[PDB]
Amino acid sequence: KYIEYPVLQKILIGLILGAIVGLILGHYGYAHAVHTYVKPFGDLFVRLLCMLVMPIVFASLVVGAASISPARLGRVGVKIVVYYLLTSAFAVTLGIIMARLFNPGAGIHLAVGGQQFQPHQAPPLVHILLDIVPTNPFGALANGQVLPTIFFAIILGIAITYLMNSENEKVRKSAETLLDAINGLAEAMYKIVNGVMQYAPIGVFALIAYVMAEQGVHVVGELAKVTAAVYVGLTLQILLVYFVLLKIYGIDPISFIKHAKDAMLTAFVTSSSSGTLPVTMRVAKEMGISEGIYSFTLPLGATINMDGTALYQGVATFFIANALGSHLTVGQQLTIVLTAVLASIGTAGVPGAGAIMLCMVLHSVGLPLTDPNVAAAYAMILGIDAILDRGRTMVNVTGDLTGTAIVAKTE
Amino acid sequence: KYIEYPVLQKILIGLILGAIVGLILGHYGYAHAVHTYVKPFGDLFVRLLCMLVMPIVFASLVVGAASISPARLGRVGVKIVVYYLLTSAFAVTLGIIMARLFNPGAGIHLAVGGQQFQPHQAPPLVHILLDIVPTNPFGALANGQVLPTIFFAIILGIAITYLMNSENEKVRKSAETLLDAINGLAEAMYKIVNGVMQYAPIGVFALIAYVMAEQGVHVVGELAKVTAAVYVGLTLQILLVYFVLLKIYGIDPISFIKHAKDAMLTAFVTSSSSGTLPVTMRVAKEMGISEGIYSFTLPLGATINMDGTALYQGVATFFIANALGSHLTVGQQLTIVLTAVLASIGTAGVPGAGAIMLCMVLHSVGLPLTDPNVAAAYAMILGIDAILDRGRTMVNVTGDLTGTAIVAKTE
Amino acid sequence: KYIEYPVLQKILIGLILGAIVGLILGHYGYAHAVHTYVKPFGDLFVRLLCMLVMPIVFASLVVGAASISPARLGRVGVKIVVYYLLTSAFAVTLGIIMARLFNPGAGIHLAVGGQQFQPHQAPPLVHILLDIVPTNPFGALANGQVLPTIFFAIILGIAITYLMNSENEKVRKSAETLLDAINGLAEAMYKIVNGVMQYAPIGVFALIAYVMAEQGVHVVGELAKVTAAVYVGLTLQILLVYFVLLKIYGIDPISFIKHAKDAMLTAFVTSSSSGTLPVTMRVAKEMGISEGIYSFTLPLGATINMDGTALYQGVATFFIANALGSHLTVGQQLTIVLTAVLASIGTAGVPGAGAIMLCMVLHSVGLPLTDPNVAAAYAMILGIDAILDRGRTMVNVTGDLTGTAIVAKTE
Ligand SMILES: N[C@@H](CC(=O)O)C(=O)O
Ligand SMILES: N[C@@H](CC(=O)O)C(=O)O
Ligand SMILES: N[C@@H](CC(=O)O)C(=O)O
Ligand code: NA
Ligand code: NA
Ligand code: NA
Ligand code: NA
Ligand code: NA
Ligand code: NA
């Protein structure tokens, strides 16, 4: 098969090349030949992605919850946890504000079938709150229904950790083997993630080629406007979150960045925050950080605290909804700030990662990707994912080193 | 949050306090204000309970089945197992007879929506027997359908133990790893049980507060009549089961009870038969029981043979059905004696425990808690659970010490 | 219960005895007393079998996929794997040709309820290909839907093995515990297989007794015609596959068979390819095979490469379809060759085994066992399973030793 190129560029080749192949078929031989012979491969891609969502949403958050489960962390760790959380929970809100001064999508509106998308009425507040609790975890998990799966997963991991403290040894052992299996379910799903990302050049080619064949040249303006909102969201994250909470603790932010240079760029290119752990810890020592702290937080911030992804997912959600012509009620809107945090925690730190967990923040707020409108819109961001992914990863790692430095000053 | 009180009293505070708050709103401001702002919290409680049912029904009985799976028990254990079973199977039957000379519920009848509850016709005997076998374990387990889940679980655990006897070591190896995960699934669910029981003060408050707000003071008579049927069932259990099968084997029952004093009272207050194992074994030695016998049976009787719970579940089932105006056919009636035994086996030995497993003996015999009538009735018993749980636990432990004594005499 | 006889004969007693009991009730006291009092036990049997299908289809193929998962096998193994596959993929195709020059079924036509079976239209090619990918593995697995379950299972096991190669040791470990759990799920399901095969004498008795009571005697002609197609398919397999690819590599096939004597007959009688592994390796040395080769391939060919089962399954599928009056389109027909290979890989190597995986190759090609027509036909093959199983097993083992010999010559 000989297909050995570096996935990042590889995909970008799919993206640019497929874009041109889309536009030149915008005129000339009509897009209907694309939708018949090109779209299928893109659909295969999308299917393989919103395939992984449910397993990784479950196991990932049983792990993640076990990773934060109080009490199962030194008071050094409570600090870095709370920091990590409020950095994701601010970063997503920022992504909303970027989705406010920018309207990504708005002006691209589509109805696929001459049938515009319309949301089902939100049940009573009582019934939606009660509905986050599953009635039969197996059931809820089985057929979509993401939020119950979340709640159960978190509850599970947390309980598991409290099994590991038990007097009995059969009990603690059992907790170990189980949690250890759930982890590994997740990790295997991430191996699958990578495997799909090898198909990403083709799938992207087909998706953006199809989207370019239709919709004319509207999309480029919008997609670039989204990339705008995202990145200027990220650097606003850095210059307003990190640079501000660095001076408050007496850290020189400039030199901080000069030390983080290698880790930030390495994450920027590899886009595997987990694969950019050795360089992040090399940068950990290089700036005088205690062994016992950077050995604890950086491998936690590897999988937890990906606040750049939280931002990305907020922005992406507003792009989807605006592309469909829906206005996001200030209840699902804060269900974004709430959800994209947990989706950030669940995100792998791998080339694909956050886009898959986008499915999760979209199965919430009622935008199922079984609906043609949504699936079509999701495919668009998914096409330009390769672009956003790099800087997003960069901010995911910048968060880790930042938090480590702040908790390090106080201990 | 500061909420640190002892859960038992804590809950009793919720129960009494919420009762009064119910009755004073029985007059005055109509109950409709309760149902809007108070009932939601109780509903959250009930949902959290009938949530755990399916996972614990599966894993719990895979465990339990492995715990009794012949041949994986010494003939020292065969005796104590047979005893345990016939004690649960008599105790439930006794609970039915207590639900015969007492009619708990009967005279409380309700139709919630002015629509009285009515059972779907019982299919052919052939088809109901065949239906205990699931057609696709995953499916049956997933969306309710309790009995198949049981049969599969039991078959599974039993098979697992026969893997542990296999010549091969990869086989006998893996066989544990599973069983060890399934256990731990169960045990984690019990940690969750505890966690919900920390919400129990509120949920109970809301439930009996709502029930008192409507239904007037009818309920107090009935609920107390149920408590009656239960407890006099328990003491009839002791004085007719235990006291008789103690004299048949030459044990002095009076002094027996004086030794069991500490264990029975400890169980009575902690209401955690599992948490009352150290005192049960202290009382085991204190009355001259062999190390090799009381080290085997008492930690089995901790989770298995909770025949006071079996009685409770018989009575409770008749309370539910009688509260709805349904008469229990002597076909579902013996499905109670058959089921509530298995539900006793699956019960944890934890504060909540049996209250959750009622869901199981009610998804059997066809009283799903998805039907408003049933959920309303279940909420009532569920409110006064804290009361019955104590003496019930007491009988669960008294059974354990009794059986240990008899198998010890014969060995 | 005293039921201790050797299962093989035992079942044949059920088969012959029940056959006569069927025909004498063909006249005389009409079959309706059978269908009322005899059929239920057969139905119980069938339910217990198509029960195991989904768990073993999942776990079996996660294991099985891990068993072949490249790269985690030496190039010594690549050879024997490719051989194993193309032997199964030729053997099933041969079973189709045997189902062509014989028309088994055709002329037995039945509509059980005076309603002949008719297939739902096959969706677009695009949509069936996309549909092999599951949308929510949990869901697809839960309610039937075989092929998605397969695709996910294979992807999973393969990914798991790539976890076992990971730099990290927590990862490497977790992968082990998980994969190790899925194995053991499968193996336990095979213990259940055996246990059901202890009920086989009765269930078979009831099945062929019912089938003989109706349909007159024409069934005997058809069933024996199936046995014909099967066995002469097997010996055509040997004399055209094995004997030819033995001469191509300079192996003396006659003496080869004289050495394989003990293994072939032992497999023929025990019908447990897995239980006939020690004798297969005894014959491995007895004909001068390298320790490092026959210790690797023969324990793989135990569970993988059961090409006699693949043939059996092709023939059985054509028997079903022809018994219903359906002609197998050359697309589901090659879905047979594609599927029955995987079902062969998943097959246990146990007395029951392949018949259960027949459920799988029948939920593919769209012949679900929820439709009475199919279930009635499947029950027929299932009745005469005991006969085909022996020679089938024999060919399953002959394939293993053959492959071992050839790869041994080339290395
Ligand atoms: N690739 C990002 C995560 C994402 O794509 O959302 C990371 O490595 O952190
Ligand atoms: N709590 C009881 C069981 C139950 O609540 O049903 C025990 O410890 O035995
Ligand atoms: N019994 C066969 C498998 C089957 O029945 O399909 C074997 O041992 O290989
Ligand atoms: Na994450
Ligand atoms: Na991060
Ligand atoms: Na038990
Ligand atoms: Na007990
Ligand atoms: Na197989
Ligand atoms: Na074989």
Rounded CA-CA distance A245/A239 in Å is 10
- Is residue B160 less than 8 Å (CB to CB) from chain C? yes
Rg of chain A, C-alpha, whole Å = 21
- Is residue C177 less than 8 Å (CB to CB) from chain A? yes
Resolution to 1 decimal, in Å? 4.1
- The answer for residues whose C-beta is within 8 angstroms of residue B286's C-beta and 6 or more apart is B259, B262
Rounded CA-CA distance B80/C164 in Å is 45
DSSP state of C304: S
Residues of B with Cβ-Cβ distance to A181 under 8 angstroms: 181
For residue C112, how many C-alpha atoms fall within 13 Å in the half-sphere facing its CB?
13
Tally of residues, chain B? 411
Cα separation values, B210 from B39, B221, B358, Å: 6, 16, 21
Q: Are A343 and A376 a contacting pair, CB within 8 Å?
A: no
Beta carbons of B47 and A135 less than 8 Å apart: yes
Q: Are A293 and A76 a contacting pair, CB within 8 Å?
A: yes
Rounded CA-CA distance A189/C157 in Å is 10
Q: Are A66 and A178 a contacting pair, CB within 8 Å?
A: no
Q: Are A317 and A365 a contacting pair, CB within 8 Å?
A: yes
Residues of B with Cβ-Cβ distance to A137 under 8 angstroms: 51, 54-55
For residue C196, how many C-alpha atoms fall within 13 Å in the half-sphere facing its CB?
31
Q: Which two tokens stand for residue B35?
A: 């149902």
Residue C377 CB burial class (10 angstroms; 0-12, 13-18, ≥19): buried
Residues of B with Cβ-Cβ distance to A142 under 8 angstroms: 142-143
Q: Are B231 and B391 a contacting pair, CB within 8 Å?
A: yes
- Is it true that the peptide bond before C175 is cis, omega within 30 degrees of 0? no
C-beta of A353 in contact with ligand 1 (< 6 A): yes
Instruction: For residue C121, give the amino acid letter.
Output: Q
Q: How many CB atoms lie within 10 A of CB A314?
A: 29
Q: Are C359 and C306 a contacting pair, CB within 8 Å?
A: no
C-beta of C396 in contact with ligand 3 (< 6 A): yes
- Smallest Cβ–Cβ distance between A188 and the set C130, C160, C170 belongs to C160
C-beta of B385 in contact with ligand 2 (< 6 A): no
**Using alpha carbons only, what angle is made at residue B258 by residues B252 and B261, rounded to the nearest 5 degrees?**
135
From C274's Cα to the closest Cα of chain B, the distance in A is 12
Q: Residue B118, SS3?
A: coil
Q: Which two tokens stand for residue B71?
A: 């041949």
Alpha helices in A271-384 (DSSP H): 277-286, 291-294, 298-303, 307-324, 333-346, 354-363, 372-383
| Cβ under 8 Å to A: B residues 218-277 | none
Beta carbons of A184 and C162 less than 8 Å apart: no
Please state the atom number of ligand 1 nearest to the C-alpha of residue A309: 6
Block residue for tokens 């505890």? B194
Rounded CA-CA distance C142/C144 in Å is 6
Rounded CA-CA distance C234/C36 in Å is 38
Rounded CA-CA distance A237/A89 in Å is 12
Q: Which of C138, C180, C187 is the best residue to mutate to test the B interface, defined by the most B CB atoms within 10 Å of its own CB? A: C187
- Angle at which helices A7-24 and A385-410 pack, to 10 degrees? 140
- Is residue B282 less than 8 Å (CB to CB) from chain C? no
- Is residue A217 less than 8 Å (CB to CB) from chain B? no
Q: What's the helix, strand, coil split of chain B in %, to 5?
A: 75, 0, 25
The enclosing H or E element of B365 equals: none
C-beta of C272 in contact with ligand 3 (< 6 A): yes
Report the candidate in B142, B388, C308, B188 with the shortest Cα–Cα distance to residue A134: B142
Residue A12 CB burial class (10 angstroms; 0-12, 13-18, ≥19): middle
Rounded CA-CA distance B339/B92 in Å is 10
- What does A296-322 look like in DSSP terms, one character per residue? TSHHHHHHS--HHHHHHHHHHHHHHHH
Report the candidate in A173, A180, A196, A195 with the shortest Cα–Cα distance to residue A49: A196
The best mutation among B87, B237, B273 to test binding of ligand 2, ranked by most ligand atoms within 8 Å of the C-beta, falls on B273
Report the candidate in A278, A266, A274, A300 with the shortest Cα–Cα distance to residue A353: A274
- Is residue B36 less than 8 Å (CB to CB) from chain C? no
In which region does residue C232 sit, left (phi positive, over 0), alpha (psi from -120 to 50) or beta (all else)?
Answer: alpha
Class of domain B7-410: mainly alpha
Q: Are A397 and A267 a contacting pair, CB within 8 Å?
A: yes
Residues of B with Cβ-Cβ distance to C50 under 8 angstroms: 135
Cα separation values, A272 from A278, A349, B258, Å: 11, 5, 67
- Smallest Cβ–Cβ distance between A177 and the set C139, C162, C177 belongs to C177
C-beta of B309 in contact with ligand 2 (< 6 A): yes
Beta carbons of B135 and C48 less than 8 Å apart: no
- Is residue A370 less than 8 Å (CB to CB) from chain B? no
- Angle at which helices B385-410 and B75-101 pack, to 10 degrees? 140
- The answer for residues whose C-beta is within 8 angstroms of residue A20's C-beta and 6 or more apart is none
Q: Residue C245, SS3?
A: helix
For residue A170, how many C-alpha atoms fall within 13 Å in the half-sphere facing its CB?
8
C-beta of B302 in contact with ligand 2 (< 6 A): no
Q: Which two tokens stand for residue A220?
A: 């480029």
C-beta of A280 in contact with ligand 1 (< 6 A): no
Rounded CA-CA distance A320/A379 in Å is 10
Q: Residue C165, SS3?
A: coil
Report the candidate in B152, B161, B151, B156 with the shortest Cα–Cα distance to residue B70: B161
Cα separation values, B29 from B24, B113, B203, Å: 8, 21, 21
The pair phi, psi for residue A336, each rounded to 5°, is -70, -55
C-beta of A308 in contact with ligand 1 (< 6 A): no
Ligand 7 centre from B302 Cα, in Å?
A: 5
Rounded CA-CA distance B335/B361 in Å is 9
Beta carbons of A187 and C175 less than 8 Å apart: yes
Rounded CA-CA distance B104/B222 in Å is 6
Beta carbons of A135 and B48 less than 8 Å apart: no
Method used to determine the 3D structure: X-ray
For residue B190, how many C-alpha atoms fall within 13 Å in the half-sphere facing its CB?
23
Rounded CA-CA distance C71/A161 in Å is 35
Beta carbons of C51 and B178 less than 8 Å apart: no
Q: Which two tokens stand for residue A219?
A: 């999309």
The pair phi, psi for residue B160, each rounded to 5°, is -55, -50
Rounded CA-CA distance C123/B179 in Å is 42
Rounded CA-CA distance C305/C80 in Å is 10
Please state the atom number of ligand 1 nearest to the C-alpha of residue A397: 9
Q: Which two tokens stand for residue C135?
A: 């949308």
Q: Which two tokens stand for residue A16?
A: 């640019």
Beta carbons of C178 and A184 less than 8 Å apart: yes
- The answer for residues whose C-beta is within 8 angstroms of residue A203's C-beta and 6 or more apart is A14, A41, A42, A44, A45, A46, A196
Beta carbons of A183 and C174 less than 8 Å apart: yes
Q: Which ligand is nearest to the CA of B386?
A: 2
Rounded CA-CA distance C245/C251 in Å is 9
Name the residue of chain C whose CA is nearest to B163's CA. C188
Report the candidate in C175, B222, B193 with the shortest Cα–Cα distance to residue A155: B193
Q: Which of A39, A176, A191 is the best residue to mutate to test the C interface, defined by the most C CB atoms within 10 Å of its own CB? A: A191
Neighbours of ion ligand 4 (CB under 5 A): A 303, 306, 345, 347
Rounded CA-CA distance C212/C218 in Å is 9
Rounded CA-CA distance B98/B382 in Å is 19
Q: Are A59 and A192 a contacting pair, CB within 8 Å?
A: no
Report the candidate in C265, A164, A254, A98 with the shortest Cα–Cα distance to residue B191: A164
Burial B89-107 (b: 16+ CB within 10 A, else e): bbbbbbbbebbeebebbbe
Q: How many helices (H) and strands (E) does chain B have?
A: 18, 0
Rounded CA-CA distance B306/B344 in Å is 6
Q: Residue A245, SS3?
A: helix
- Is residue B217 less than 8 Å (CB to CB) from chain C? no
Report the candidate in A173, A158, A159, A137 with the shortest Cα–Cα distance to residue B348: A159
From B261's Cα to the closest Cα of chain A, the distance in A is 26
- The answer for residues whose C-beta is within 8 angstroms of residue A263's C-beta and 6 or more apart is A276, A279, A280, A282, A283, A397, A401
Q: Residue A216, SS3?
A: coil
